[PDB]
């Protein structure tokens, strides 16, 4: 062969492309023409039959309009006269309703902040390259189906799709690679003429190959203990420490939209947490309904032995929990079976420096003293940067590279996810000391509440005297009697807002405003400001794409130094309608809430139902681009009120619309995100997505509530979990990961064993 | 039956924005062969004419039978037709820059109701072919609202909002598929979206259903703002500013014989660099295919100019559009195949007969039989005007060849218009014998075919 002879051949095979196209376009036109639809819903009678020309002949006080007509004839459209003019009376019809105040986008409600990807700036209220690329891509899609039937027709030695893919990333016979080259150019000669914009390099066609393409799809997820680490890889890498979902709102979006999950690998992976559990264990029941090893005592797949391996490592040196009953219920084996396998297997050795206690903070009395405001930046959120929780082996000192003591301008306290303990580390946060049969953890308190002073809400787990454990449980959000005493500083986790209603704002300047639908007393939490969490450049890009570059963009600063803003333009809640006033009746505050940062509004005056809410915007909404160039019922009001969803007008006195928050679209997004990984097998995605669809709906902030929700999941999905080997195995890895974290108590692994065995025996039908 | 329209009547309606006609639609619910009646919408008025064919060339076929003024503050630019669900009398919906749809009882000249809820001006309106009580509004607030005029929905007539992030700027065009469950939307953000509506309950709806994801979404068919979009069967016609083409194209894997996907079947934007995503897709394939581009020279920088296909059983599909320089263009879609057949018979006869081939005009008193008796004989359609010269063959290709998806199909009929005229909208009578083009200067151009003069 010669480059010119094959280019000659391609040129004659190319002849089928336009004639096939003409065949296709012509075929679809005739199918469409013959499938044309018959007009429906005709009336039995002509409804205009009784209506005459309304033209006037040579009225009184009736509006009138003129129309001059011309007639035309011939091929040229020439008129036959200068034309005739007529007058008609006019029927004037006024609308009976006024439009609602203006707005842009469909405003949807979210129960919590969602993490936004970064977008490309394509629309603003080089183009030359973008048109070029699209013309090429359209052409590559046209010719792609022709490559291999043409290679077949030509029958050129070495001219195979696999081998052109080889020559392009440049084993391939001598006259193979010769043909390879002669094919590549010639293709370019026939199809990549650099004069035309409708051109395509063969290389562009090969990159569309289903085996080639995932090479550039950057959606990648990630002794005896090396097997465990690897088996748990997907859970240690994706499992959120805050909320326990594998695709959630936490972690960090990098500029190319790669996510760093807020997961175990952020604090050293499995081992540093697991060694620590083993140690704590070192310094320290009923039989199952499946032929337990308590009472007694078919070849094994390597997956089944792996399953028992990691469950044995993860359970660890436990005193009242053992792998047998749980592994057994995971496989289909009697508890003695795995006991036999376990004993047949015979499955590392386990290894506190006194520190100068800090005078500004006593972690045993739960108290800040003296200089503390000047000593630390734990409480000042606008200057904080987000560092992975410390997982070093030493005391938290600048010497061991502890970011908590050293990464910031001042030391911050170690939090619940730091691998230190309160006994080792004088920086460890221990919750507040408040307790009271009355109200406690207030602003203006004997001793004050250390959680309030640190501008954080109480921790369900560590704040054990104030009753935070119960009052931060959303399931008791409407127990008014509960919340009338005890901890008064978990309003954001309580998740219950004051009754509010959308309306037309009283200000002759604003559109919508938000109005109180109940009485609010000074000091009460009103609402959270939710929205999309975005980066600095994402805010800049959005200010452009919305024509803001007269302020039209509002981007609540959540963490100034870290660079996170909250944009409620599309997703958020009714707080996005609160108007500005220099003397407002509410006030925002940024609060640390279980390692989330969040925005609450608290009333600063007494607001009666029907009154509008205002706050002083202050510097909360910087102009990012310009900084860079340098019985609940509708109240009676004067303003009209609207349903937030339908925008129908509310009747003052009617029942406040309480619409259940619709999140199916958000679960979809998260389901699809895990499905995108080339890194995950179908059986991992299947279970991960199932767990995430349940746990996301629960909006977990605290390990306090994980055991309960975990148990409600094993019970709603027990049938599903036993139907298919891979599902139980993947469930087993989840619980392995959660037990290595000491976040799942032994009491729920046992209750899960019983829930599973009952579903499995129930299936033995 | 191969006949294309001629100008028969024009008129100028007095200036009422002191001014354009922005919409024209013939009433579609009249019993077969009833006099066609259309409404033309200016910024303040709906002009409603009956058209009646005439033996007299100087008779005025047009009768203005109703003239309604929007007595509020709105300037309108969109209309569509519906019916009273109880009485069956015609309802005209008019919408404009305040964000409200007015529904008019036009035979009685009364307000039927107002449709309130958009946060910005409405630029387009469309009735579902499957249900005459279902209306779709496209708005500057970037959403589509689906409204129902059925009795069960009177206390809350918004049954659906197409929201989410599929659109980010003002919408100019909304269109229904004939099955009534697929909606096309497009506008200034250059995104064309296809949404699948759910079935809506036969009862009161406290809140409309919200859809957050289109099932097909692309910004890559055009390189500019898209101001008009329509289904042609399951194919798609769309037009953008600056391009001087109407593009026929196809979503890969889309068929209306397949079951209708639900909301959670929609693709979600997981890769922020992809400018096309689609539920319907089957080497990576195109998710869409450009089929053909009708050439509409001289639209300039004008936008908000709409085309209309005439598409009815047993009659030729006709694409009509008027540009921004006083020209109205027509394409007969059945000519495309007729041309392909005649050119097929031609080459097959030039090979079997060494060039001894004789072309003959059909539609005379002839038959390819009376043609064969006189001596290969090839039947040429009468509307194919000039072995043939090269210029003749190029002139024929330019109008009729569908071999190049980025070629440019020249109008089959180009009728000039007196004075400067920018076309905004085209509408066809039910039986296809009238075609009304409206546009600036409150002018209407009335084209006829199959007349009686
Ligand atoms: C240019 C578009 C830009 C991207 N953008 C983004 C948004 C969210 C938005 C909105 C909007 O959602 N508001 C509701 C609202 C909120 C959310 C909060 C408060 C306190 N209060 C409110 O009302 C409105 C407009 C807009 C356009 C024209 C207009 N007109 C007045 C007189 N000139 C002609 C028409 N007014 C408002 C633009 C918007
Ligand atoms: Zn999370
Ligand atoms: Zn047991
Ligand atoms: Zn440390
Ligand atoms: Zn630390
Ligand atoms: Zn520490
Ligand atoms: Zn306290
Ligand atoms: Zn506390
Ligand atoms: Zn407390």
Author numbering:
A (entry chain B): 197 to 254, 259 to 325, 360 to 404, 427 to 428, 430 to 479, 491 to 552, 567 to 579, 588 to 637, ...
B (entry chain A): 8 to 25, 38 to 301, 307 to 399, 404 to 414, 489 to 555
What does the paper say about this structure?
Polycomb Repressive Complex 2 (PRC2) is a histone methyltransferase complex composed of core subunits Ezh2 (or Ezh1), Eed, Suz12 and Rbbp4. PRC2 trimethylates histone H3K27 (H3K27me3) to mark developmentally repressed chromatin. Ezh2 contains a split catalytic region composed of the SET domain and the SET Activation Loop (SAL) but is inactive without minimally associating with Eed and the VEFS domain of Suz12 [Suz12(VEFS)]4–8. Pyridone inhibitors bind to Ezh2 in an extended pocket that overlaps with the SAM binding site.
The hydrophobic drug-binding pocket of Ezh2 is formed by residues P302, R304, F305 and H307 in the SAL domain, and Y809 and Y878 in the SET domain (magenta and blue sticks, respectively). Clear electron density was present for GSK126 in all regions except the sec-butyl “arm” group and the terminal piperazine ring of the “tail”, even though the drug molecule binds in a site that is less enclosed by the ctEzh2 residues compared to the human structure. The carbonyl and amine groups of the pyridone moiety of GSK126 mimic the carboxylate and amine of SAM to hydrogen bond to the backbone of Y809, directly competing with SAM binding in a manner similar to the human version. In the SAL domain, the imidazole nitrogen of residue H307 hydrogen bonds to the carbonyl on the linker between the pyridone and the indole moieties of the drug, and residue H307 itself is stabilized by hydrogen binding to the carbonyl oxygen of residue R304. The backbone amine of residue R304 also hydrogen bonds to the linker carboxyl oxygen in the “neck” region of the drug, whereas the side-chain of residue R304 undergoes a conformational change compared to the SAM-bound structure, and supports both the indole region of the body and the pyridine region of the tail of the drug via hydrophobic interactions. The side chain of residue P302 also provides additional support for the latter. The piperazine region points outward toward the solvent, similar as to the GSK126-bound human PRC2 structure. We then tested the inhibition of ctPRC2 by GSK126. In contrast to human PRC2, GSK126 was a very poor inhibitor of ctPRC2 with an IC50 value of about 100 μM (and protein purity in Fig. S2A). While residues 656–661 fold into a tight helix in human Ezh2 and residue Y661 cages the drug in the active site, the aligned region in ctEzh2 (residues 845–851) contains a partially disordered flexible loop (dotted line), that is located away from the drug.
